[PDB]
């Protein structure tokens, strides 16, 4: 009765269980039928369990067993190309017991080791897997396998004369993997999307919320990031699936390609589905299973992206479990406990100095789906308070065909300064100044349009008409991007700054021409403008040539006066 128990009663969604004396609060438990549940209430004479599935498959007297985890997960060769679920298992084992991996010794007998130290290498999947001493294990390597082929269960090394080490290890998904120090946000997570990388930077190991109404393009930002972001591994928790969003990803993503290599994106991905037929328990645990797997890959020295479809649905699954447990409902009937929990999740994000040195990171991008535009509780409200970044897809920007549909007035980062140096050193010295200048343009346009809404546009001076002219070019020629075009579907960093300088250079020239009494109507029909408008479609630097083409054309306007 310490490790197992027997159902006392079931109905009203809670299973009351006799025994399970050693179960932890919030541990997954297993019913004989194969369903899983979460230990919610520990009482003196029972355990109350939330069932992650249909309770008619549970009867009084049924056997219940501990799993021992908030955890666990297997972490070794065989993770790549693999497809698991909420609790890691082929879409049952986790890591192939038969598959043979080429182990390469990276330590000699007599070496002193500590948790996180690399003792061997396995080309399981190029990627090169790095075999590490499990956290909390140190001493002297007394025995170590030679370069050969072995299955996971085999022992490759012994430490302190008997702890035995394998190629894999287990870890409680609920407990964030140890590290020496979490490095302050310093390195940008190069997205390749100009608006993001420029105006609303995400830092490697940053938490940046994705929020907005249904059908605004939230998931799409995530999917493009995975297809092109500078993370080696992606952990997609494709939650809030419905109608066919499950089969939409089931046989689809297995075909999506890795733009970087031209191989399947799944070859560097881990999918965690959260369908409606699944218990609130499983979907609740899905972010924790994912984050743990994410932390596992960053431990190797990889930069991983954790994309959470979404937390609104996770909080609804949690509210269902809480109400069934009779916990007191608050705002929108959500339990009091949610804010601290959600925060605790996002806190596990960050770029760290892994056990045994080396740097890795987990960047989180979470989808926000309020009950309907209200943008309050659960999701949005609590999330936007944690996350450092928010990319606001705007349905009005979308209807206007301005892509990406990210509102440059309502979005914020908190990563702009964090990533500016990467851009300045690797792309362009004037990245930050350019995006600040464009944003001030857009900011000024917003103010001007508000006034025009009142007093009309007839009183507008030439100076104000020029600002609207250039503001419009920024929106149409820069902000808007065509995801369906073979070229503009992705905009390399080098192309993003070059297009920015063509626009900003046209601005300076525009304001300079006006100051010299050039009719704005003359500038508005300037021939180069139509070329600037199609610049996003050019795949060659022929784009920076537009700067000189702009200057001479203005000269032809300085000539005619």
């Amino acid at each position: 009765m310490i490790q197992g128990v027997i159902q006392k009663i079931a109905g009203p969604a809670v299973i009351a269980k006799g025994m399970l004396g050693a179960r932890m609060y919030d541990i997954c438990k297993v019913g004989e039928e194969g369903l899983v549940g979460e230990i919610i209430r520990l009482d003196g004479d029972t355990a109350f369990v939330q069932v992650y599935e249909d309770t008619s498959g549970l009867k009084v007297g049924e056997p219940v067993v501990s799993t021992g985890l908030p955890l666990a997960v297997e972490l070794g060769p065989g993770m790549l190309n693999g497809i698991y679920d909420g609790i890691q298992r082929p879409l049952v084992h986790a890591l192939d017991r038969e598959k043979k991996w080429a182990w390469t010794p990276m330590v000699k007998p007599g070496d002193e080791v500590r948790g996180g130290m690399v003792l061997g290498t396995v080309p399981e999947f190029g990627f090169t897997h790095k075999i590490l001493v499990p956290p909390d294990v140190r001493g002297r390597v007394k025995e170590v396998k030679p370069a050969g082929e072995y299955t996971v269960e085999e022992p490759v090394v012994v430490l302190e004369d008997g702890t035995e080490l394998k190629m894999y290890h287990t870890w409680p998904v609920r407990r964030a993997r140890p590290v020496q120090r979490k490095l302050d946000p310093n390195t940008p997570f190069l997205t390749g999307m100009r608006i993001l990388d420029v105006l609303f930077p995400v830092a490697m190991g940053g938490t940046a919320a994705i929020p907005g109404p249904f059908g605004s393009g939230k998931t799409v930002t995530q999917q493009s990031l995975a297809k092109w972001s500078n993370a080696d591994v992606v952990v997609y928790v494709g939650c809030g699936e419905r109608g066919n969003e499950m089969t939409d990803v089931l046989v689809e993503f297995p075909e999506l390609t890795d733009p970087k290599t031209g191989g399947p994106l799944m070859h560097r991905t881990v999918l965690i589905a959260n369908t409606s037929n699944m218990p609130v328990a499983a979907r609740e645990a899905s972010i924790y299973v994912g984050v743990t797997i994410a932390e596992y890959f960053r431990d190797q020295g990889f930069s991983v992206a954790l994309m959470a479809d979404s937390t609104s649905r996770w909080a609804e699954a949690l509210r269902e479990i809480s109400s069934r447990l009779e916990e007191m409902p608050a705002e929108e009937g959500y339990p009091p406990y949610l804010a601290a929990r959600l925060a605790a999740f996002y806190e596990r994000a960050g770029k760290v100095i892994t056990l045994g040195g080396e740097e890795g990171a987990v960047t989180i991008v979470g989808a926000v789906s309020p009950p309907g535009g209200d943008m309050s509780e659960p999701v949005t409200q609590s999330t936007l308070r944690i996350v450092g970044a928010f990319w606001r897809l705007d349905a009005s920007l979308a209807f206007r065909r301005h892509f990406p549909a990210i509102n440059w007035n309502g979005s914020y980062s908190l990563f702009t300064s964090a990533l500016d140096p990467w851009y300045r050193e690797n792309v362009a010295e004037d990245y930050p100044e350019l995006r600040d200048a464009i944003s001030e343009l857009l900011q000024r346009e917003a103010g001007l349009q508000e006034i025009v809404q009142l007093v009309g546009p007839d009183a507008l001076q030439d100076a104000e008409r020029l600002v609207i002219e250039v503001g419009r070019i920024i929106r149409e020629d820069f902000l808007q991007q065509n995801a369906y075009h073979e070229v503009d579907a992705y905009c390399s960093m080098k192309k993003a700054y070059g297009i920015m300088k063509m626009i900003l250079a046209f601005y300076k020239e525009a304001e300079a021409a006006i100051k010299r009494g050039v009719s704005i109507d003359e500038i508005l029909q300037l021939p180069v403008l139509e070329r600037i408008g199609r610049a996003r479609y050019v795949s060659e630097e022929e784009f920076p040539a537009y700067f000189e083409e702009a200057m001479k054309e203005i000269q032809g306007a300085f000539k005619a006066l």
Partner: protein
């Protein structure tokens, strides 16, 4: 034009009237269901 802002201003305040006060008979009704239960 200060006609716009004028009577049309009456506009915004019957509009605003209508619901920070209506939206409230309500945050509070639902309280009221299991607020009362």
């Amino acid at each position: 034009i200060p006609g716009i802002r004028a009577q049309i201003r009456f506009i915004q305040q019957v509009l605003e009237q209508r619901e920070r006060e209506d939206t409230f008979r309500l945050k509070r009704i639902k309280g009221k269901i299991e607020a009362r239960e």
